[PDB]
Amino acid sequence: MISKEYHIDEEVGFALPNPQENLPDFYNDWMFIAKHLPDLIESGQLRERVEKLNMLSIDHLTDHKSQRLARLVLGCITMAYVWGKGHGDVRKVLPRNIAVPYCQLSKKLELPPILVYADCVLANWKKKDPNKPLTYENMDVLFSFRDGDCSKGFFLVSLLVEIAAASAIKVIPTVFKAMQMQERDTLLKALLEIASCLEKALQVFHQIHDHVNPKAFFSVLRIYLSGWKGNPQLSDGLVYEGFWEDPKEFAGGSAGQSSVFQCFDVLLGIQQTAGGGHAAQFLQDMRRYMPPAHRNFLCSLESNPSVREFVLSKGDAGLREAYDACVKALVSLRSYHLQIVTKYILIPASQQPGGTDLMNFLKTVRSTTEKSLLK
Numbered sequence: 001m002i003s004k005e006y007h008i009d010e011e012v013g014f015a016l017p018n019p020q021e022n023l024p025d026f027y028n029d030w031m032f033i034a035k036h037l038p039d040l041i042e043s044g045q046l047r048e049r050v051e052k053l054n055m056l057s058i059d060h061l062t063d064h065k066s067q068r069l070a071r072l073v074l075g076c077i078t079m080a081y082v083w084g085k086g087h088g089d090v091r092k093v094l095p096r097n098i099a100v101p102y103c104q105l106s107k108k109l110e111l112p113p114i115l116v117y118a119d120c121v122l123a124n125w126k127k128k129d130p131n132k133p134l135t136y137e138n139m140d141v142l143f144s145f146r147d148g149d150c151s152k153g154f155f156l157v158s159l160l161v162e163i164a165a166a167s168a169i170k171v172i173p174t175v176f177k178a179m180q181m182q183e184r185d186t187l188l189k190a191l192l193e194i195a196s197c198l199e200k201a202l203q204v205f206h207q208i209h210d211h212v213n214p215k216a217f218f219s220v221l222r223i224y225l226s227g228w229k230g231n232p233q234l235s236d237g238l239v240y241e242g243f244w245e246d247p248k249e250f251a252g253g254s255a256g257q258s259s260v261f262q263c264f265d266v267l268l269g270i271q272q273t274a275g276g277g278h279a280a281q282f283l284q285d286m287r288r289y290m291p292p293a294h295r296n297f298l299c300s301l302e303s304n305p306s307v308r309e310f311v312l313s314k315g316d317a318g319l320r321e322a323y324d325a326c327v328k329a330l331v332s333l334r335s336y337h338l339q340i341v342t343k344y345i346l347i348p349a350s351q352q353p354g355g356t357d358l359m360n361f362l363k364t365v366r367s368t369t370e371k372s373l374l375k
């Protein structure tokens with residue numbers, strides 16, 4: 001098993017197992033607003049309602065799950081406050097009452113004070129029936145922004161890919177154990193098992209089309225996930241009133257923030273963070289937007305010896321093929337992600353009376369992955 005300090009679950013991987021839904025009664029004023037985002041945003045009273053809050057101490061958030069739920073609550077409210085109805089009228093100052101505890105909590109959890117993937121995917125879910133399995137029909141999100149925003153489909157399908165990935169993640173220790181102990185047959189089997197699970201993950205990824213509509217994603221959800229780093233709407237970032245005097249820039253939610261998005265690249269020695277380019281920069285930067293336990297896990301993967309070099313040094317076509325099977329599965333996942341950006345961002349952007357930067361990042365990532373094929 002993976003060490004408990006890395007907060008990786010056998011079943012759900014990097015996802016937070018059975019997330020907490022309700023905070024203490026002390027935080028009811030946060031919870032009410034977060035649970036009623038569709039109505040409060042629509043009616044133009046979210047902002048005043050945030051502005052009416054008293055400053056609540058973070059001391060009553062005792063356990064990790066309650067602390068993560070509070071991050072999810074505060075993060076969603078923050079995006080709602082900043083972006084409002086999503087029509088370009090923006091707040092450049094986050095009020096003291098909310099900003100101080102959010103930044104305090106964020107400092108405690110070692111995450112930046114913005115909604116990240118780890119909040120809105122990994123901690124933003126529940127089973128409808130706890131006795132039934134982890135499928136789309138038996139699941140839903142904890143929070144959404146707007147009616148018809150497709151947050152359920154977008155967050156949960158991301159989560160399901162993340163859960164499919166967990167089957168591969170748990171094999172990682174078998175890979176490194178097999179190398180140090182020089183167990184070629186065991187290593188071969190482990191790599192084939194990883195390939196299998198990543199192929200399954202791709203089939204799970206196909207569900208995005210069933211539950212997410214392009215127009216709604218591009219024109220609504222994408223707006224609420226946007227950040228204030230290199231964003232002309234908040235050119236100098238966002239003022240967190242009471243915590244920092246000067247405005248600070250933070251990137252919005254991204255698949256690049258997923259630990260699965262990087263961990264197989266690291267495992268297999270696909271040097272995604274090498275070469276000094278923009279994509280390498282972004283992936284490294286996005287480790288700061290992951291929970292510390294997961295950044296630490298990626299660190300420990302880096303610090304183990306290279307699987308690529310081991311396979312390359314052995315003159316073993318069988319091992320080479322099992323490694324390539326992993327690389328090829330990653331290639332297909334990257335290609336599929338690209339196809340999704342085309343349908344969900346590029347095309348809607350063209351029909352509107354930008355998205356290229358994301359496409360270029362992903363093309364770089366895919367290209368690097370292809371170039372790692374040994375045959």
Ligand SMILES: O=C(Nc1ccc(F)cc1)C1(c2ccc(-c3cnc(C(F)(F)F)cc3CO)cc2)COC1
Pocket residue numbers: 116117120121154155157158161162165208225252253254255258260261262264330333334337340
């Ligand atoms: O953008 C996405 N979700 C997202 C959610 C919240 C947010 F704040 C921002 C974004 C989508 C996506 C989901 C999974 C991958 C993915 C793809 N490939 C690998 C791989 F590394 F295994 F190849 C891992 C993941 C990670 O599991 C890529 C995108 C959903 O449909 C787009």
